[PDB]
Amino acid sequence: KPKIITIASIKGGVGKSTSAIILATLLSKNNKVLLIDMDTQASITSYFYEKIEKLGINFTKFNIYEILKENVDIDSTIINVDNNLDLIPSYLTLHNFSEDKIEHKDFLLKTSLGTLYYKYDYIVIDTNPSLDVTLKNALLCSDYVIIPMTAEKWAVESLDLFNFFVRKLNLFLPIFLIITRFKKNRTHKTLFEILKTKDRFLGTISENKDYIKEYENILEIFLKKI
Amino acid sequence: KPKIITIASIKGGVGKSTSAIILATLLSKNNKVLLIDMDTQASITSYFYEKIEKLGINFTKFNIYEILKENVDIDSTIINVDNNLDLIPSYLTLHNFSEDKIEHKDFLLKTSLGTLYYKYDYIVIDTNPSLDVTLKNALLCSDYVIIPMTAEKWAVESLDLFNFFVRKLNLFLPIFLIITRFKKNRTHKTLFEILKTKDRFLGTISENKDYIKEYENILEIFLKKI
Ligand code: NA
Numbered sequence: 001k002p003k004i005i006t007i008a009s010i011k012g013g014v015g016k017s018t019s020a021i022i023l024a025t026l027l028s029k030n031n032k033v034l035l036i037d038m039d040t041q042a043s044i045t046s047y048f049y050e051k052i053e054k055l056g057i058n059f060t061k062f063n064i065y066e067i068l069k070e071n072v073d074i075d076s077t078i079i080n081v082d083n084n085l086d087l088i089p090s091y092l093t094l095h096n097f098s099e100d101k102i103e104h105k106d107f108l109l110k111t112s113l114g115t116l117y118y119k120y121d122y123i124v125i126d127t128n129p130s131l132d133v134t135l136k137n138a139l140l141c142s143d144y145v146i147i148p149m150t151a152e153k154w155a156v157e158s159l160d161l162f163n164f165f166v167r168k169l170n171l172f173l174p175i176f177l178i179i180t181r182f183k184k185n186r187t188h189k190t191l192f193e194i195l196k197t198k199d200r201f202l203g204t205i206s207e208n209k210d211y212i213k214e215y216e217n218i219l220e221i222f223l224k225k226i
Numbered sequence: 227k228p229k230i231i232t233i234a235s236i237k238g239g240v241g242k243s244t245s246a247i248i249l250a251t252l253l254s255k256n257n258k259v260l261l262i263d264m265d266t267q268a269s270i271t272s273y274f275y276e277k278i279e280k281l282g283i284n285f286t287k288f289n290i291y292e293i294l295k296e297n298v299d300i301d302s303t304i305i306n307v308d309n310n311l312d313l314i315p316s317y318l319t320l321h322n323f324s325e326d327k328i329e330h331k332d333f334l335l336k337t338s339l340g341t342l343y344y345k346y347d348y349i350v351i352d353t354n355p356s357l358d359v360t361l362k363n364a365l366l367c368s369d370y371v372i373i374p375m376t377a378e379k380w381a382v383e384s385l386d387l388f389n390f391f392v393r394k395l396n397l398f399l400p401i402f403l404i405i406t407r408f409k410k411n412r413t414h415k416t417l418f419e420i421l422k423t424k425d426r427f428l429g430t431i432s433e434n435k436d437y438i439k440e441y442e443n444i445l446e447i448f449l450k451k452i
């Protein structure tokens with residue numbers, strides 16, 4: 001069975017989707033990885049758009065929302081975008097999902113992944129920065145959550161809120177933390193000193209490169225802790 | 227009765243909240259204006275946070291979500307932040323709203339504003355870039371919508387989607403358009419040539435200042451057209 005990681009944040013602008021791309025890409029080097037763009041903003045899909053255009057994929061018809069609606073089969077949406085890196089793209093129609101009236105709505109992605117799953121070692125799911133039914137679908141499939149967060153007003157309260165949300169879903173779902181946009185010269189490192197003592201704190205990403213090496217480090221620590 | 231303007235976009239990163247602040251601030255110069263932050267990300271509230279801290283307001287207890295939940299009275303949340311500019315702040319707890327089970331949920335803001343309204347000439351409501359029940363609450367109170375949008379993949383499709391959403395609410399709600407981050411040197415001005423022929427197209431904002439003057443222009447055209 002694949003290990004399923006949701007990349008989440010209920011704050012926008014914390015490099016959620018960047019983290020998802022990079023961690024997934026790193027995992028793809030020695031594992032088979034599916035990346036699922038479940039973000040209405042579709043940043044991961046935009047990042048790979050060039051490659052998707054070259055293959056002439058109709059992601060208007062073949063996308064995560066059309067899977068959730070059971071209008072297409074999951075396998076027909078899967079796009080190879082890098083070596084050992086497959087992608088299910090998002091499209092703006094995902095915006096309707098929260099309003100669609102559907103039975104057993106929370107379990108639609110869990111159902112769909114079950115028909116597939118076994119081809120993959122990891123599934124990394126990128127979600128909207130909202131507590132909504134799209135997120136619940138991700139969380140109910142997942143084994144782990146990684147939250148990239150930034151030193152900001154209300155960061156710990158936001159984290160508490162997200163945690164509350166997970167419990168009220170009735171999940172026992174471990175959440176691992178990264179501080180992104182990390183400012184080594186910051187005067188009051190108030191988030192770092194709160195988070196650093198937590199067992200699931202992975203590390204910081206500074207505000208071929210030294211960027212990727214910081215992610216490799218985070219990833220190494222995560223894979224060690226799980 | 228106040229004229230109620232929802233500032234919306236289902237794409238993030240188009241200066242939705244910046245537009246809301248600036249248009250509202252301009253309207254406040256010769257009118258009494260209430261700004262409502264109904265965005266889970268709370269950018270307008272962050273913008274005014276300094277002023278809110280100086281007044282020692284507990285926006286943990288007194289905020290738009292607590293109004294929607296009927297735990298506090300609207301008037302007890304209102305914060306004066308500039309001359310003729312009042313503010314109802316947002317807080318991260320707004321994230322739970324989409325999941326709260328509540329009767330006549332779509333009309334909660336409309337109900338709350340009715341107990342107040344009459345003190346104001348304009349109410350400007352900033353919303354999340356999501357099609358959800360928070361947005362519906364805004365739209366059902368509104369007389370007009372202004373959408374600041376950017377030259378991007380899927381812009382016209384996103385606009386179509388938003389329009390579909392408004393009709394399915396059963397509203398006859400005019401939508402006015404701005405292109406923000408406008409690049410006068412752009413090679414293919416494909417959005418501008420589509421939008422420029424529409425009667426509700428207000429104009430462009432370029433990527434005391436010349437910035438405010440472009441907004442004044444947009445605002446003048448809007449007030450002329452309505
Ligand atoms: Na939605």
Ligand code: NA
Nearest residue numbers: 131132321324
């Ligand atoms: Na929500």
